[PDB]
Design an enzyme around this catalytic site. Structure first.
Site, mmCIF file in Angstrom:
data_model
loop_
_atom_site.group_PDB
_atom_site.id
_atom_site.type_symbol
_atom_site.label_atom_id
_atom_site.label_comp_id
_atom_site.label_asym_id
_atom_site.label_seq_id
_atom_site.Cartn_x
_atom_site.Cartn_y
_atom_site.Cartn_z
ATOM 1 C CG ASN A 26 -43.648 59.828 24.897
ATOM 2 O OD1 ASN A 26 -42.615 59.476 24.307
ATOM 3 N ND2 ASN A 26 -43.672 60.684 25.906
ATOM 4 C CD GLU A 75 -32.315 50.029 12.798
ATOM 5 O OE1 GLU A 75 -32.026 50.503 13.908
ATOM 6 O OE2 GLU A 75 -33.070 50.607 11.922
ATOM 7 C CD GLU A 77 -30.099 54.595 13.799
ATOM 8 O OE1 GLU A 77 -30.410 55.630 13.235
ATOM 9 O OE2 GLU A 77 -29.904 53.515 13.196
HETATM 10 C C1 LIG Z 1 -33.276 51.978 12.108
HETATM 11 C C2 LIG Z 1 -34.271 52.468 13.103
HETATM 12 O O1 LIG Z 1 -34.065 52.021 14.451
HETATM 13 C C3 LIG Z 1 -35.613 51.921 12.553
HETATM 14 O O2 LIG Z 1 -36.781 52.179 13.369
HETATM 15 C C4 LIG Z 1 -35.916 52.465 11.156
HETATM 16 O O3 LIG Z 1 -37.094 51.835 10.582
HETATM 17 C C5 LIG Z 1 -38.365 52.340 11.010
HETATM 18 O O4 LIG Z 1 -38.365 53.762 10.956
HETATM 19 C C6 LIG Z 1 -38.278 54.267 9.615
HETATM 20 C C7 LIG Z 1 -38.306 55.785 9.653
HETATM 21 O O5 LIG Z 1 -39.668 56.173 9.811
HETATM 22 S S1 LIG Z 1 -39.992 57.677 9.972
HETATM 23 O O6 LIG Z 1 -39.896 58.324 8.666
HETATM 24 O O7 LIG Z 1 -38.982 58.191 10.884
HETATM 25 O O8 LIG Z 1 -41.344 57.725 10.550
HETATM 26 C C8 LIG Z 1 -39.433 53.832 8.746
HETATM 27 O O9 LIG Z 1 -39.240 54.353 7.406
HETATM 28 C C9 LIG Z 1 -39.516 52.317 8.723
HETATM 29 O O10 LIG Z 1 -40.727 51.932 8.055
HETATM 30 C C10 LIG Z 1 -39.486 51.772 10.145
HETATM 31 N N1 LIG Z 1 -39.349 50.336 10.040
HETATM 32 C C11 LIG Z 1 -40.174 49.430 10.583
HETATM 33 C C12 LIG Z 1 -39.763 48.040 10.208
HETATM 34 O O11 LIG Z 1 -41.160 49.681 11.283
HETATM 35 C C13 LIG Z 1 -34.779 52.149 10.195
HETATM 36 C C14 LIG Z 1 -35.093 52.758 8.839
HETATM 37 O O12 LIG Z 1 -35.509 52.017 7.938
HETATM 38 O O13 LIG Z 1 -34.910 53.988 8.647
HETATM 39 C C15 LIG Z 1 -33.437 52.618 10.778
HETATM 40 O O14 LIG Z 1 -33.470 54.034 10.877
HETATM 41 C C1 LIG Z 2 -42.622 61.397 26.581
HETATM 42 O O1 LIG Z 2 -42.943 61.315 27.985
HETATM 43 C C2 LIG Z 2 -41.892 61.739 28.863
HETATM 44 C C3 LIG Z 2 -42.184 61.459 30.354
HETATM 45 O O2 LIG Z 2 -43.470 60.864 30.577
HETATM 46 C C4 LIG Z 2 -41.642 63.222 28.611
HETATM 47 O O3 LIG Z 2 -40.499 63.609 29.395
HETATM 48 C C5 LIG Z 2 -41.435 63.528 27.117
HETATM 49 O O4 LIG Z 2 -41.440 64.950 26.923
HETATM 50 C C6 LIG Z 2 -42.483 62.879 26.197
HETATM 51 N N1 LIG Z 2 -42.109 63.065 24.783
HETATM 52 C C7 LIG Z 2 -42.931 63.475 23.795
HETATM 53 C C8 LIG Z 2 -42.343 63.589 22.409
HETATM 54 O O5 LIG Z 2 -44.101 63.746 23.982
#
Ligand SMILES: *[C@@H]1[C@H](O)[C@@H](O)[C@H](O[C@H]2O[C@H](COS(=O)(=O)O)[C@@H](O)[C@H](O)[C@H]2NC(C)=O)[C@@H](C(=O)O)[C@H]1O
Ligand SMILES: *[C@@H]1O[C@H](CO)[C@@H](O)[C@H](O)[C@H]1NC(C)=O
Ligand SMILES: *[C@@H]1O[C@H](CO[C@@H]2O[C@@H](C)[C@@H](O)[C@@H](O)[C@@H]2O)[C@@H](O)[C@H](O)[C@H]1NC(C)=O
Ligand SMILES: *[C@@H]1O[C@H](CO)[C@@H](O)[C@H](O)[C@H]1NC(C)=O
Ligand SMILES: *[C@@H]1O[C@H](CO)[C@@H](O)[C@H](O)[C@H]1NC(C)=O
Ligand SMILES: [Cl-]
Lengths: 74, 385
Positions: free
Chosen positions: B4, B185, B67
């Site tokens: 979060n 997206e 997603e």
């Molecule tokens: C669509 C998703 O909604 C989108 O957020 C995502 O792109 C972001 O997340 C990617 C995955 O990151 S991580 O490995 O899970 O930490 C990341 O590679 C991208 O940099 C990030 N994009 C931006 C612009 O911040 C894309 C994606 O490219 O995978 C889709 O999943």
């Molecule tokens: C994010 O916060 C919510 C409520 O404040 C909680 O239910 C949830 O477990 C938190 N998620 C993570 C990944 O810490």
């Protein structure tokens, strides 16, 4: 001979796309960058954004589901 | 591995101001992983944001979750489509009681229609489809980690998008017939894009083909991942300089109208020469009611020469041909329009996008590994009013 004949269907529109058909995102994760205010305040970036108007701007991404609004934060 | 984070009123104002000042319509994705004991959506955080946005007179459209098909992987929480539908009904009730009671609601931003995602989408539209203004889903051709240059040029890769689109419409026609369908997206490659590919001229084959097919097949709005940010599928790089897909996007916007028609190539081979036809964008001050915009992709390794059918064979055509600026060929981050490099005039000023008039009755030259728009002047197509 590398020449190719095209056939066109022009009787009626097959579909109508939004004037905003070509839209764009800003990833939810960009709001976790310390420089978010500087980046989106960039006059150069806003000029390029205005170039694609009209368009939707979707603020969303994986981080959509890991962001919490805190009305006390500065 | 996702944690979060909080965001401020300031961050909301930055986002809103950027959209408002740029002439864009903001859609804000709300957190769907805020859950009650009985795995209902807990709307209390959204309520705070709706109230803040109301107090500032912000005209905003809404989404809920991103997603949701991958929530178990991302957060070890499984939300089924039925429950998500109910969650959207709860958001719709909050919007209806807000200052912007006619605010639009889109979702559910599912990934492309694998069996488990198709099932979640179907159960979501059964439960929740009444309260959404459009159905949003996502598409990527490739994994950014493994994508190759040949993949970016392969018509068999481009063609896979057709089956994804057919599968989404099969689900929507079964549940909410006639509901608008949006790509919420979409990009060449997920995981932030394919290094040295997603930010180049070579990215444009997938982007222009996606736009062509989306328009042809009934998708109403396509949201490009990403305008700006982490990942080389961005339209604008870290220096706020436009990449080839930005220029392609701008040219598409200037030339291509809302009314979609159809083009095809005579003969049994339709893979490597890809053609699309719309009415010309009426807002373009050079053109007039009835004009056509053709756009074409040449994935052959030789120039092709296109002949227009009667009664368009002898019309004045304007060419808008995009080619990379050397020396890096299709892996270039610079593009020329009709042999003129596309660059900002200054930080406040886009350049003119200069046509090349062709000799009336000449065939339309499309070089190897290129894409072009062609405006057919005085086409007088009644369908284009
Ligand atoms: C669509 C998703 O909604 C989108 O957020 C995502 O792109 C972001 O997340 C990617 C995955 O990151 S991580 O490995 O899970 O930490 C990341 O590679 C991208 O940099 C990030 N994009 C931006 C612009 O911040 C894309 C994606 O490219 O995978 C889709 O999943
Ligand atoms: C994010 O916060 C919510 C409520 O404040 C909680 O239910 C949830 O477990 C938190 N998620 C993570 C990944 O810490
Ligand atoms: C060029 O492409 C060939 C396959 O494409 C076909 O042949 C060329 C000449 C064009 O006529 C095209 O329209 C055809 O579809 C390959 O077999 C060949 O290896 C390629 N040549 C090189 C060296 O890349
Ligand atoms: C929803 O979340 C808020 C803040 O996290 C919490 O205090 C409230 O009681 C929750 N509601 C339910 C029904 O769980
Ligand atoms: C979906 O989830 C809820 C719990 O969140 C459950 O009560 C319901 O039966 C589930 N629906 C189906 C079709 O399994
Ligand atoms: Cl499900």
């Amino acid at each position: 001979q590398d020449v190719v004949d095209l056939d066109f269907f022009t009787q009626e529109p097959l579909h109508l796309v939004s004037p905003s058909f070509l839209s764009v995102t800003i990833d939810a994760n960009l709001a976790t960058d310390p420089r978010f205010l500087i980046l989106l305040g960039s006059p150069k970036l806003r000029t390029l954004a205005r170039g694609l108007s009209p368009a939707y701007l979707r603020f969303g991404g994986t981080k959509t589901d890991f962001l919490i609004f805190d009305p006390k934060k500065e | 591995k996702f944690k979060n984070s909080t965001y401020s009123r300031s961050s909301v104002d930055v986002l809103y101001t950027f959209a408002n000042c740029s002439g864009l319509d903001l859609i804000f994705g709300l957190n769907a992983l805020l859950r009650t004991a009985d795995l209902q959506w807990n709307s209390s955080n959204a309520q705070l944001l709706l109230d803040y946005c109301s107090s500032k007179g912000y005209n905003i459209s809404w989404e809920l979750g991103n997603e949701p098909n991958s929530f178990l992987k991302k957060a070890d929480i499984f939300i089924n489509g039925s429950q998500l539908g109910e969650d959207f009904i709860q958001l719709h009730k909050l919007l209806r009681k807000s200052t912007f009671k006619n605010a639009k609601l889109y979702g559910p931003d599912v990934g492309q229609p694998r069996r488990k995602t198709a099932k979640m989408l179907k159960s979501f539209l059964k439960a929740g489809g009444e309260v959404i203004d459009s159905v949003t889903w996502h598409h990527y051709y490739l994994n950014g980690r493994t994508a190759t240059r040949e993949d970016f040029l392969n018509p068999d890769v481009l063609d896979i998008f057709i089956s994804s689109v057919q599968k989404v419409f099969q689900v929507v026609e079964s549940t909410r017939p006639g509901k608008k369908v949006w790509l919420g997206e979409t990009s060449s490659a997920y995981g932030g894009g394919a290094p040295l590919l997603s930010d180049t001229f070579a990215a444009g084959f997938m982007w222009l083909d996606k736009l062509g097919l989306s328009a042809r097949m009934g998708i109403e709005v396509v949201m490009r991942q990403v305008f700006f940010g982490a990942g080389n599928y961005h339209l604008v790089d870290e220096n706020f300089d436009p990449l080839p897909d930005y220029w392609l996007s701008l040219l598409f916007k200037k030339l291509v109208g809302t009314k979609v028609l159809m083009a095809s190539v005579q003969g049994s081979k339709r893979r490597k020469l890809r053609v699309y036809l719309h009415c010309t964008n009426t807002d373009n001050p050079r053109y007039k009611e009835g004009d056509l915009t053709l756009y074409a992709i040449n994935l052959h390794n030789v120039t092709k020469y296109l002949r227009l059918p009667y009664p368009f064979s002898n019309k004045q055509v304007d060419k808008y041909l995009l080619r990379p600026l050397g020396p890096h060929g299709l892996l270039s981050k610079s593009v020329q329009l009709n042999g003129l490099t596309l660059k900002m005039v200054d930080d406040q000023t886009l350049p003119p996008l200069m046509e090349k008039p062709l000799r009336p009755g000449s065939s339309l030259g499309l070089p190897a590994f290129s894409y072009s728009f062609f405006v057919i002047r005085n086409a007088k197509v009644a369908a284009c009013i």
